[PDB]
């Protein structure tokens, strides 16, 4: 069956781990390390291949923000370097439309990006596209009906409840209804045609609440909260259920993986990562 892949993350420095969780049997498998350690990255999957995008290597030797894009083939257990983005993007959000990867926002040093670029795997090229209305790092990104969504995050000064949507054929961003909750560093994913925003940080506390956006009602509605409040969590969808992995809560790095069942509106803790960590990239194939 399909596996949940978690790549990189942070705990006393940025990590190189790639591990795969099998939700059907509860097992974790250690796979080939990232070639360069990274935290604050994002994962996504195009054509059965796993991509690690952006992040930074924050080590005791000093920090380097990453413009890198790397590709893992699960059939071969080999990582291959791809063309880098035009700029480093730490705490990036990514979404995939028509087999192309959009890189959204993130930071390079003190710069909080509003910019956005699009990678075509068949050509190995990145192209810049229109920038967001707002600079957003720690931004949640999801794709619904071939429109790209940038949700919450941090603009350099304020944590945001705002969200905006990009229409590729118009190459245009517009603001949509804002979330009920200010969230920076939430996990954002699409499940059953609704955009979910789980957790995050509001400038004072980590959040365990979770709300979802419906394009049809233009409304954000709360669902059951997670058991553990968290920000800088990885989030993904595996056979119609949401998983959140790790994060930070002001006191600890979480190893907790929680699972949301939309058919019962309930969370459970289904496994723990082999060590607590924040800022992972995660995807399913």
């Amino acid at each position: 069956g399909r596996l949940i892949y978690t790549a990189g993350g942070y705990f006393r420095q940025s990590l190189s781990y790639l591990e795969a969780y099998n939700p059907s049997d509860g097992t974790w498998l250690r796979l080939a390390d990232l070639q360069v350690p990274r935290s604050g990255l994002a994962g996504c999957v195009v054509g059965g291949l796993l991509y690690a995008v952006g992040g930074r290597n924050n080590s005791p030797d000093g920090n380097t923000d990453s413009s890198a894009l790397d590709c893992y083939n699960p059939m071969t257990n080999q990582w291959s370097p791809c063309a880098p983005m035009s700029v480093p993007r730490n705490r990036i959000g990514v979404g995939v439309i028509d087999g192309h990867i959009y890189a959204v926002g993130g930071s390079h040093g003190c710069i909080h990006h509003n910019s956005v670029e699009r990678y075509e795997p068949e050509r190995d090229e990145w192209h810049l596209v229109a920038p967001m209305l707002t600079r957003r790092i720690g931004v949640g990104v999801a794709v619904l009906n071939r429109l790209l969504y940038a949700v919450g995050g941090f603009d350099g000064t304020n944590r945001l409840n705002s969200a905006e949507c990009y229409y590729p054929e118009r190459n245009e961003w517009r603001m949509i209804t804002a979330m009920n909750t200010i969230r920076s560093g939430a996990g954002v994913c699409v499940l059953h045609n609704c955009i979910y925003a789980a957790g995050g940080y509001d400038g004072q506390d980590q959040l365990n609440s979770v709300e979802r956006y419906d394009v049809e009602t233009e409304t954000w509605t709360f669902v059951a909260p997670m058991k553990h409040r968290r920000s800088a969590l990885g989030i993904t969808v595996h056979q119609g259920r949401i998983y959140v992995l790790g994060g930070y809560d002001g006191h600890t790095f979480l190893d907790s993986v929680e699972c949301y069942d939309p058919d019962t509106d309930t969370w459970s803790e289904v496994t723990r990562m082999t060590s607590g960590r924040s800022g992972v990239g995660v995807a399913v194939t």
């Binding site: 942070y10 924050n58 920076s184 930070y248 800022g279």
Partner: peptide
Amino acid sequence: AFFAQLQLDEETGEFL
């Protein structure tokens, strides 16, 4: 240039 102490990122827990 001053070998400043690291600061805590309240969101991610990283020290920079």
